[PDB]
Design an enzyme around this catalytic site. Structure first.
Site, mmCIF file in Angstrom:
data_model
loop_
_atom_site.group_PDB
_atom_site.id
_atom_site.type_symbol
_atom_site.label_atom_id
_atom_site.label_comp_id
_atom_site.label_asym_id
_atom_site.label_seq_id
_atom_site.Cartn_x
_atom_site.Cartn_y
_atom_site.Cartn_z
ATOM 1 N N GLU B 49 -39.353 -34.595 17.146
ATOM 2 C CA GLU B 49 -40.177 -35.790 17.318
ATOM 3 C C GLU B 49 -41.115 -35.432 18.488
ATOM 4 O OE1 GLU B 49 -39.492 -38.184 15.022
ATOM 5 O OE2 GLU B 49 -41.168 -39.345 15.857
ATOM 6 N N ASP B 60 -41.713 -46.728 26.347
ATOM 7 C CA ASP B 60 -41.116 -45.608 27.092
ATOM 8 C C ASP B 60 -40.719 -45.956 28.518
ATOM 9 O OD1 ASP B 60 -40.901 -43.173 25.351
ATOM 10 O OD2 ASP B 60 -43.042 -43.692 25.005
ATOM 11 N N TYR B 175 -35.136 -45.177 11.600
ATOM 12 C CA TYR B 175 -34.812 -45.084 13.023
ATOM 13 C C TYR B 175 -33.819 -46.175 13.388
ATOM 14 C CZ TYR B 175 -35.622 -43.533 17.768
ATOM 15 O OH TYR B 175 -35.515 -42.991 19.006
#
Ligand SMILES: O=P(O)(O)OCCNS(=O)(=O)c1ccc(OC(F)(F)F)cc1
Ligand SMILES: O=P(O)(O)OCCNS(=O)(=O)c1ccc(OC(F)(F)F)cc1
Ligand SMILES: *Cc1c(COP(=O)(O)O)cnc(C)c1O
Ligand SMILES: *Cc1c(COP(=O)(O)O)cnc(C)c1O
Ligand SMILES: [Cl-]
Ligand SMILES: [Cl-]
Ligand SMILES: [Cl-]
Ligand SMILES: [Cl-]
Ligand SMILES: [Cl-]
Ligand SMILES: [Cl-]
Ligand SMILES: [Cl-]
Ligand SMILES: [Cl-]
Ligand SMILES: [Cl-]
Ligand SMILES: [Cl-]
Ligand SMILES: [Cl-]
Ligand SMILES: [Cl-]
Ligand SMILES: [Cl-]
Ligand SMILES: [Cl-]
Ligand SMILES: [Cs+]
Ligand SMILES: [Cs+]
Ligand SMILES: [Cs+]
Ligand SMILES: [Cs+]
Ligand SMILES: [Cs+]
Ligand SMILES: [Cs+]
Lengths: 393, 268, 393, 268
Positions: B49, B60, B175
């Site tokens: 990834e 993030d 995911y």
């Protein structure tokens, strides 16, 4: 699936990580419920009246317009508790937080006015407030940082990215994406993901509702145009909303032109940016050729934001509102003119709206026009900024 | 191509899970990032990834925020990232390559054009972190027109409607978020959990990769034992880069040791 | 010979040089005429409403009083245009100046709030304003000096005597004694020679009139006590006036105790000074054993005045009002408490009134009492004063 | 005593006007002030007007403001001023001595007691600058009980009622203000004028002394020619003190020369 339309034509939406969708859906449902609840409405009206000081005055400025066919009124949001219009919608969002059973508030701030507004609402209403602020802004806004701390809020400097407003926006969303079960994110303008542009409009719309009643009382007719500065869009959409369906009433939004559009040092993405997707929304923004989110610029810290609320982009696209820009020097001259001729010290943000009204008058001084400028805030905070430039002159 | 389908079939034949590192392209510079990525593969990475540096990575935590900043200090642009991607694919023809994107970089110069460029360089999937399934239509349609898997996210508290949508709309892998919040090794997640993994299989979803907070071999083993097809680890990898900036050969040795241990944990 | 009584019992009078008597008689006659003139009243009411933002809110403070039998309201003069109650009476005095045909204003100021108020009224109403300010005050009040200059006023430093407020008061009277034919002296508090204590009361009395109507509306009864800080006496007499004849309503004035009465470093002449004759009046003042006019002291620059209006001395003498003092530290704690529990930043002056109400509550927490504090101003101007002390702690 | 009545009778016998300097007691210090005052008398002063230093002299312009400040720098108190006054009278038994006071110094420790102290040291008059006729009752009554003349002020625009009051209430001399404003040599006044001087005589007022702005011999001559009994000069005298602080013998010589010229102008 939502209860309300998240878009204004192509603009708006809910461009957040999947983890945040339930928080936005919960907020939308609580808002829709609150808007139908007469007890919520009565509580909000009571705070606005008895704590914040609504209705705010509508002041006729005769000295400014002498010798012309312009009649100019100022809607006096500078008189609201806190010295700016931001107080209206933070009170409503704090009540929504409590409706949902939340006890904590997260807010972003650049110039610090939203942080102070959030801190004051949270102190009044028994919420624990934390405020993200880019470290560069923390450094340059000591007075506001101290106000926030005096009111019991935690101020958390943000060092990532450019260490300014957009980075504080990111950090508020990062926190919320892990804390939404207990905290409400008190977004500071009519932007971001749905339902925020809608909620902030509805919790600011008393600006325009009052203006309409006041101008009808004083003049027996609606304004030819209402004029408001545009940072993220809250004060302007608050002024505009109740006039949108009055098709004769012009709606004029004023973005900061900074050093001049041609310099690239400005904050006018609606007319001079490019549509992008950031901060939860599809909207015009300040961005590089590659799509990195760029820094904007204005003499007024409060207008220095690299996008705009999606409802403004929509109103522009259909021609219902017109958007213009005013440079730093134009805003400074309007600030000085209002001080000297009316005894009112306007926020530098609001001075952009006033500067455009003065141009409307001066360019066509025999045009009959009834104008309202939204005086979004007072300018005590700006006297040294203005001093330091007039000193260098 | 369907590189993920081939990978998962091969891993299934071996009763094996996937181990998938994340890094930021061009962190700490283009040449060292290419060496890092070759190291991850040689050490046993099943897939990659790869993040394109973005100004505002709002999913993030600090470790990956700092990776993006290092790449920008090195002048890394999306065009340079696509050059890197083309070279990585020319070296490694079968490893699945997924991009971690933020919406503005995809939308910037046209959504269709973005996915066409991904197809040209040999990318297999794109995860757009700030586009929820509710906003995904033009992204997933463009991905599929260009033979790119659009990756969607199943949160831990996903209801049945959302599971159905992720199962229908996604391709390549699903995911499986380990927890709320943002990326980071400092915050361990769940507890995949099993109910979600089972419902996804019932709905014929693409195989699940668990991510967020995976920093140890024991977590990789647990993810696979819970029924996930594998696990993704980003911050734990990026921390090794951060720790060894001044020592690029040591950086590569530590990455290799870590990835080897993480991949070992996925084996039957 | 005068139209109105220049004395309040033994206090007050017209102790000015003979040359100034005709100016005081002219001013008294114009005031008496204006008070009977419905057009003057309508003009004054219109400015107060549409320019200054009256009526100001009356805010119930529930968090502060939780767990006690005190109900506390704040009269929100902090929301008035300019951020303090001073704006009310400068608007009325500017209208009197114009009634008399004068085109120039002289004003004194210490902390600068009166100078700013005078400058703003003069800008609005087309008067040429000059402001005397002790040179020591000029040095320490740059923000206010800059506001005055932005509004077009001339600020004249005074270097004589102690170069502080009393010396500016003298200089304003020296100027007036030669310029009265064209200039009005816009005195800044309810003190000085008749007719000023009367005029300033009457142009502040809407504070108490509104409070009475608001408390009747909210509580169905009058307050047990109204509490106000006392510098020269204007905000306090403005709150008190309409209640004087409501014999059940306590009137409590709060002088600054500074570092403590026993230190001599205070500003509490009404309770701890000695009657003298200065600034046109017979009143309690801060003076040496020999009769030199002494300097007072408070953390709050706005309360730091060495006398008090004569009507307060009179109300004290007959027992109708009670006067107390609050120290710097008590005022600082009240400032912090209001910020943190109500989201309102009070002026340090007003914080003295609040501190005494908090003491009334805390000392006797099971006493049922309905209290109104006059929140005379906002405290933005004080955040650095408060910062610099809390930094040293 | 009636020192003013004797003075004015003597001056009338000579068809002469009075010249009356003002100084601040104790400016620039007690000893030099005593020498200054002896100099003024030896040079021809007919009477004296003497200020007690006060913190807030609101009828005085900068020259006399600065005199008060110099006296305070020297530690001069009202008690020291009364000591000075007693000594001046012991040296000079017939010269009329008038004080220029501000109300608080008279009221401070009791009005009656103040005028009793004036009588004890041999002062002849007191002018309280900030007590108009309208407020004067307790001051004029105490003055008269202690054989002190209370001095009142006739402004240039005095109406008939005010002239009547000043004429009835005052004693010793009537102060005829030359102009509005405050003391100072930098601002010349009028134009006494003649109408006022004539009405005062009609009402049997005490003889008029013109003051404010009198700085030259020609003004002294004009005042007397207009029918005033004399003229007072303060700032012009005090400026000589200010100019010569560093040179006390030169100060005395310049004072003598100035006073001699001013007194010469009052003679027939
Ligand atoms: O190991 P960690 O905790 O650093 O996690 C690494 C994850 N890297 S990634 O590219 O899979 C990845 C996947 C999804 C992300 O956000 C979203 F869920 F909102 F889409 C962000 C990063
Ligand atoms: O020569 P100038 O211009 O300095 O004038 C000197 C006057 N000195 S004085 O003591 O007679 C004197 C007389 C009256 C004064 O004020 C009052 F009129 F209000 F009472 C002040 C000073
Ligand atoms: C924050 C601020 C603005 C700009 O924000 P909007 O959301 O565009 O209203 C304008 N004026 C003032 C005074 C402000 O404080
Ligand atoms: C000037 C001022 C005061 C004190 O003056 P008063 O005449 O006694 O009212 C008190 N509060 C505030 C906010 C002020 O500005
Ligand atoms: Cl749409
Ligand atoms: Cl014009
Ligand atoms: Cl505030
Ligand atoms: Cl028009
Ligand atoms: Cl129009
Ligand atoms: Cl657009
Ligand atoms: Cl390790
Ligand atoms: Cl009386
Ligand atoms: Cl309690
Ligand atoms: Cl102001
Ligand atoms: Cl009570
Ligand atoms: Cl009571
Ligand atoms: Cl008293
Ligand atoms: Cl000479
Ligand atoms: Cs006009
Ligand atoms: Cs903007
Ligand atoms: Cs295993
Ligand atoms: Cs209570
Ligand atoms: Cs005081
Ligand atoms: Cs002569």
């Amino acid at each position: 699936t939502t209860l309300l339309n998240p878009y204004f034509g192509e603009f708006g939406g809910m461009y957040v990580p999947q983890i945040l969708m339930p928080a936005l859906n919960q907020l939308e449902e609580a808002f829709v419920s609150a808007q139908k609840d007469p007890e919520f409405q009565a509580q909000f009206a009571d705070l606005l009246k008895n704590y914040a000081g609504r209705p705010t005055a509508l002041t006729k400025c005769q000295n400014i317009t002498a010798g012309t066919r312009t009649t100019l009124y100022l809607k006096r949001e500078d008189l609201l508790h806190g010295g700016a219009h931001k107080t209206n919608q933070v009170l409503g969002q704090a009540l929504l937080a409590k409706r949902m059973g939340k006890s904590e508030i997260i807010a972003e701030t650049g110039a610090g006015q939203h942080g102070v507004a959030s801190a004051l609402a949270s102190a009044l209403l028994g919420l624990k407030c934390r405020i993200y602020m880019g470290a560069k802004d923390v450094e340059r806004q000591s007075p506001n940082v101290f106000r926030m701390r005096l009111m019991g809020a935690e101020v958390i400097p943000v060092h990532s990215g450019s260490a300014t407003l957009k980075d504080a926006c990111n950090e508020a969303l990062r926190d919320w994406s892990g804390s939404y079960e207990t905290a409400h994110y008190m977004l500071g303008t009519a932007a971001g993901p749905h339902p925020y542009p809608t909620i902030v409009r509805e919790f600011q719309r008393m600006i325009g509702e009052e203006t309409k009643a006041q101008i009808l009382d004083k003049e027996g007719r609606l304004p030819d145009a209402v004029i408001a500065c545009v940072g993220g869009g809250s004060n302007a959409i608050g002024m505009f909303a109740d006039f949108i369906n009055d098709t004769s009433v012009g709606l004029i939004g004023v973005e900061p032109g900074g050093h001049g559009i041609e310099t690239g040092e400005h904050g006018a993405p609606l007319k001079h940016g490019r549509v992008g997707i950031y901060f939860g929304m599809k909207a015009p923004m300040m961005q590089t050729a590659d799509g990195q989110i760029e820094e904007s610029y204005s003499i007024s810290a409060g207008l220095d934001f690299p996008s705009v609320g999606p409802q403004h982009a929509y109103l522009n696209s259909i021609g219902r509102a017109d958007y213009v820009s005013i440079t730093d020097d134009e805003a400074l001259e309007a600030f000085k003119t209002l001080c000297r001729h009316e005894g009112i010290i306007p926020a530098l943000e609001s001075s952009h709206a006033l500067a455009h009204a003065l141009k409307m008058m001066r360019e066509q001084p025999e045009k009959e026009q009834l104008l309202v400028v939204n005086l979004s805030g007072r300018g005590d905070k700006d006297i040294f900024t203005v001093h330091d430039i007039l000193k260098a002159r | 191509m369907e590189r993920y389908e081939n990978l998962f079939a091969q891993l299934n034949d071996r009763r094996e899970g996937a181990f998938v590192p994340f890094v930021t392209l061009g962190d700490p510079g283009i040449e060292q990032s290419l060496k890092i990525i070759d190291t991850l593969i040689d050490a046993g990475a099943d897939a990659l990834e790869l993040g394109v540096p973005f100004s505002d990575p709002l999913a993030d935590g600090p470790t990956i925020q700092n990776a993006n900043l290092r790449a920008f200090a090195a002048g890394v642009t999306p065009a340079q990232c696509f050059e890197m991607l083309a070279l990585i694919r020319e070296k490694h023809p079968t490893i699945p390559i997924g991009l971690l994107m933020y919406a503005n970089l995809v939308f910037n110069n046209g959504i269709d054009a973005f996915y066409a460029r991904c197809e040209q360089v040999g990318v297999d999937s794109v995860l757009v972190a700030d586009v929820p399934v509710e906003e995904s239509a033009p992204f997933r349609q463009a991905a599929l027109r260009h033979n790119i898997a659009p990756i969607f996210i199943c949160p831990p508290n996903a209801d049945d409607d959302l599971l159905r949508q992720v199962a229908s709309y996604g391709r390549g892998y699903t995911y499986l978020l380990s927890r709320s919040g943002v990326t980071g090794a400092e915050n361990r997640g769940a507890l995949p959990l099993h109910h979600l993994i089972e419902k996804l299989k019932e709905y014929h979803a693409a195989p699940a990769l668990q991510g967020f907070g995976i920093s140890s071999p024991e977590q990789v083993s647990a993810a696979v034992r819970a029924g996930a097809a594998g696990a993704i680890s980003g911050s734990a990898i990026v921390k090794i880069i951060e720790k060894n900036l001044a020592s690029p050969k040591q950086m590569l040795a530590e990455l290799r040791s870590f990835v080897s241990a993480m991949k070992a944990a996925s084996r039957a």
